[PDB]
Design an enzyme around this catalytic site. Structure first.
Site, PDB file in Angstrom:
ATOM      1  N   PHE A 197      -5.076   2.117  -4.003  1.00 32.69           N
ATOM      2  CA  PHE A 197      -6.053   2.939  -3.289  1.00 32.69           C
ATOM      3  C   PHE A 197      -5.425   4.322  -3.146  1.00 32.69           C
ATOM      4  O   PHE A 197      -4.369   4.452  -2.525  1.00 32.69           O
ATOM      5  CB  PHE A 197      -6.392   2.351  -1.918  1.00 32.69           C
ATOM      6  CG  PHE A 197      -7.612   2.968  -1.285  1.00 32.69           C
ATOM      7  CD1 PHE A 197      -7.503   4.096  -0.489  1.00 32.69           C
ATOM      8  CD2 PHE A 197      -8.864   2.428  -1.499  1.00 32.69           C
ATOM      9  CE1 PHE A 197      -8.627   4.661   0.082  1.00 32.69           C
ATOM     10  CE2 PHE A 197      -9.973   2.991  -0.927  1.00 32.69           C
ATOM     11  CZ  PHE A 197      -9.860   4.103  -0.127  1.00 32.69           C
ATOM     12  N   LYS A 231      -3.254  11.530  -6.986  1.00 29.43           N
ATOM     13  CA  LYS A 231      -2.394  12.463  -6.267  1.00 29.43           C
ATOM     14  C   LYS A 231      -1.037  12.608  -6.935  1.00 29.43           C
ATOM     15  O   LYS A 231      -0.419  13.672  -6.844  1.00 29.43           O
ATOM     16  CB  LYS A 231      -2.237  12.001  -4.811  1.00 29.43           C
ATOM     17  CG  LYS A 231      -3.252  12.656  -3.881  1.00 29.43           C
ATOM     18  CD  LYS A 231      -3.414  11.927  -2.551  1.00 29.43           C
ATOM     19  CE  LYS A 231      -4.815  12.164  -1.966  1.00 29.43           C
ATOM     20  NZ  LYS A 231      -4.802  12.946  -0.695  1.00 29.43           N
ATOM     21  N   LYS A 243      -2.895  -8.020  -5.004  1.00 30.47           N
ATOM     22  CA  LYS A 243      -2.384  -7.245  -3.878  1.00 30.47           C
ATOM     23  C   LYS A 243      -3.418  -6.232  -3.415  1.00 30.47           C
ATOM     24  O   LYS A 243      -3.580  -5.993  -2.209  1.00 30.47           O
ATOM     25  CB  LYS A 243      -1.082  -6.548  -4.275  1.00 30.47           C
ATOM     26  CG  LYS A 243      -0.476  -5.666  -3.189  1.00 30.47           C
ATOM     27  CD  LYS A 243       0.893  -5.127  -3.635  1.00 30.47           C
ATOM     28  CE  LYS A 243       1.621  -4.402  -2.514  1.00 30.47           C
ATOM     29  NZ  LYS A 243       3.014  -4.069  -2.928  1.00 30.47           N
ATOM     30  N   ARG A 295      -4.484   3.374  10.930  1.00 25.05           N
ATOM     31  CA  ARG A 295      -3.302   4.222  10.996  1.00 25.05           C
ATOM     32  C   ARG A 295      -2.504   3.849  12.228  1.00 25.05           C
ATOM     33  O   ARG A 295      -3.071   3.721  13.314  1.00 25.05           O
ATOM     34  CB  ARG A 295      -3.687   5.700  11.054  1.00 25.05           C
ATOM     35  CG  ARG A 295      -2.645   6.620  10.495  1.00 25.05           C
ATOM     36  CD  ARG A 295      -3.256   7.933  10.080  1.00 25.05           C
ATOM     37  NE  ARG A 295      -3.815   8.013   8.725  1.00 25.05           N
ATOM     38  CZ  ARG A 295      -3.241   8.690   7.727  1.00 25.05           C
ATOM     39  NH1 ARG A 295      -2.072   9.273   7.924  1.00 25.05           N
ATOM     40  NH2 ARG A 295      -3.812   8.749   6.536  1.00 25.05           N
ATOM     41  N   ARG A 298      -6.039  -8.162  -1.377  1.00 24.52           N
ATOM     42  CA  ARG A 298      -5.557  -8.540  -0.056  1.00 24.52           C
ATOM     43  C   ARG A 298      -5.457  -7.340   0.874  1.00 24.52           C
ATOM     44  O   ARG A 298      -5.796  -7.435   2.060  1.00 24.52           O
ATOM     45  CB  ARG A 298      -4.212  -9.244  -0.183  1.00 24.52           C
ATOM     46  CG  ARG A 298      -3.550  -9.546   1.156  1.00 24.52           C
ATOM     47  CD  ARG A 298      -2.308 -10.403   0.973  1.00 24.52           C
ATOM     48  NE  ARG A 298      -1.306  -9.682   0.218  1.00 24.52           N
ATOM     49  CZ  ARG A 298      -0.425  -8.830   0.728  1.00 24.52           C
ATOM     50  NH1 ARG A 298      -0.405  -8.565   2.019  1.00 24.52           N
ATOM     51  NH2 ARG A 298       0.431  -8.227  -0.082  1.00 24.52           N
ATOM     52  N   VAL A 320      -0.233   3.107   7.098  1.00 25.55           N
ATOM     53  CA  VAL A 320      -1.602   3.510   6.813  1.00 25.55           C
ATOM     54  C   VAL A 320      -2.212   2.502   5.849  1.00 25.55           C
ATOM     55  O   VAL A 320      -1.548   2.060   4.909  1.00 25.55           O
ATOM     56  CB  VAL A 320      -1.647   4.924   6.199  1.00 25.55           C
ATOM     57  CG1 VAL A 320      -3.057   5.314   5.861  1.00 25.55           C
ATOM     58  CG2 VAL A 320      -0.987   5.941   7.133  1.00 25.55           C
ATOM     59  N   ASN A 321      -3.480   2.160   6.070  1.00 21.89           N
ATOM     60  CA  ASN A 321      -4.150   1.261   5.132  1.00 21.89           C
ATOM     61  C   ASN A 321      -5.652   1.380   5.282  1.00 21.89           C
ATOM     62  O   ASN A 321      -6.158   1.436   6.393  1.00 21.89           O
ATOM     63  CB  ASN A 321      -3.722  -0.199   5.356  1.00 21.89           C
ATOM     64  CG  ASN A 321      -4.228  -1.109   4.268  1.00 21.89           C
ATOM     65  OD1 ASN A 321      -3.793  -1.022   3.135  1.00 21.89           O
ATOM     66  ND2 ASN A 321      -5.158  -1.983   4.607  1.00 21.89           N
ATOM     67  N   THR A 322      -6.364   1.381   4.162  1.00 22.12           N
ATOM     68  CA  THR A 322      -7.817   1.482   4.181  1.00 22.12           C
ATOM     69  C   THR A 322      -8.457   0.180   3.729  1.00 22.12           C
ATOM     70  O   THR A 322      -8.047  -0.395   2.715  1.00 22.12           O
ATOM     71  CB  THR A 322      -8.308   2.599   3.255  1.00 22.12           C
ATOM     72  OG1 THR A 322      -7.708   3.831   3.643  1.00 22.12           O
ATOM     73  CG2 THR A 322      -9.835   2.722   3.296  1.00 22.12           C
ATOM     74  N   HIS A 344      -6.993  -4.335   0.683  1.00 18.02           N
ATOM     75  CA  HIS A 344      -8.053  -3.340   0.803  1.00 18.02           C
ATOM     76  C   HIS A 344      -9.470  -3.872   0.848  1.00 18.02           C
ATOM     77  O   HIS A 344     -10.375  -3.087   1.152  1.00 18.02           O
ATOM     78  CB  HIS A 344      -7.959  -2.328  -0.338  1.00 18.02           C
ATOM     79  CG  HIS A 344      -6.680  -1.578  -0.350  1.00 18.02           C
ATOM     80  ND1 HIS A 344      -6.293  -0.789   0.706  1.00 18.02           N
ATOM     81  CD2 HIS A 344      -5.658  -1.551  -1.232  1.00 18.02           C
ATOM     82  CE1 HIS A 344      -5.103  -0.271   0.455  1.00 18.02           C
ATOM     83  NE2 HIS A 344      -4.711  -0.695  -0.734  1.00 18.02           N
TER      84      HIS A 344
HETATM   85 CL   LIG Z   1      -4.634   2.817   1.823  1.00 18.25          CL
HETATM   86 CL   LIG Z   2      -0.304 -12.962   2.046  1.00 21.87          CL
END
Ligand SMILES: [Cl-]
Ligand SMILES: [Cl-]
Ligand SMILES: [Cl-]
Ligand code: NA
Length: 124
Positions: free
Chosen positions: A120, A66, A7, A85, A10, A43-45, A12
């Site tokens: 992440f 965090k 995961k 974002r 996929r 949100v995703n990096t 990041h």
């Molecule tokens: Cl992220």
């Molecule tokens: Cl997938």
């Protein structure tokens, strides 16, 4: 039924490009990695480094996550990343994203055997 390590890959990893070259990168990538199925992930990096270099962060600087856990690691060097974002006008199923390219340290949580990134946490 996806493993945690898979995961992370996929969501990041994007080693195929050195950087986001256009404003539509996030729209395309959030869709092709299936992060807009059923909902817009807010949100995703994406990290533009080799998988080996990202896995190696699990042997670098141990820092707090965090959430207070102690299995997070900060990369010694900066890495090429793209933050994606959702915009204010985005609404499922027409997800819309802002693309922000940067060079930053990454912070990941690592778990397992082999000990690999599974979450992440942040970039600095
Ligand atoms: Cl992220
Ligand atoms: Cl997938
Ligand atoms: Cl230390
Ligand atoms: Na795993």
């Amino acid at each position: 039924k996806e493993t945690a390590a898979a995961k992370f890959e996929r969501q990041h990893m994007d080693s195929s490009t050195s950087a986001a070259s256009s404003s539509n990168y996030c729209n395309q990538m959030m869709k092709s990695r299936n992060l807009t199925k059923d909902r817009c992930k807010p949100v995703n990096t994406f990290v533009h480094e080799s998988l080996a270099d990202v896995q190696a962060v699990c042997s670098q600087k141990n820092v707090a996550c965090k959430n207070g856990q102690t299995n997070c690691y900060q990369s010694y060097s900066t890495m090429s990343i793209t933050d994606c974002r959702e915009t204010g006008s985005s609404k499922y199923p027409n997800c819309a994203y802002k693309t922000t390219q940067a060079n930053k340290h990454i912070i990941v949580a690592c778990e397992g055997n082999p000990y690999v990134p599974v979450h992440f946490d942040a970039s600095v």
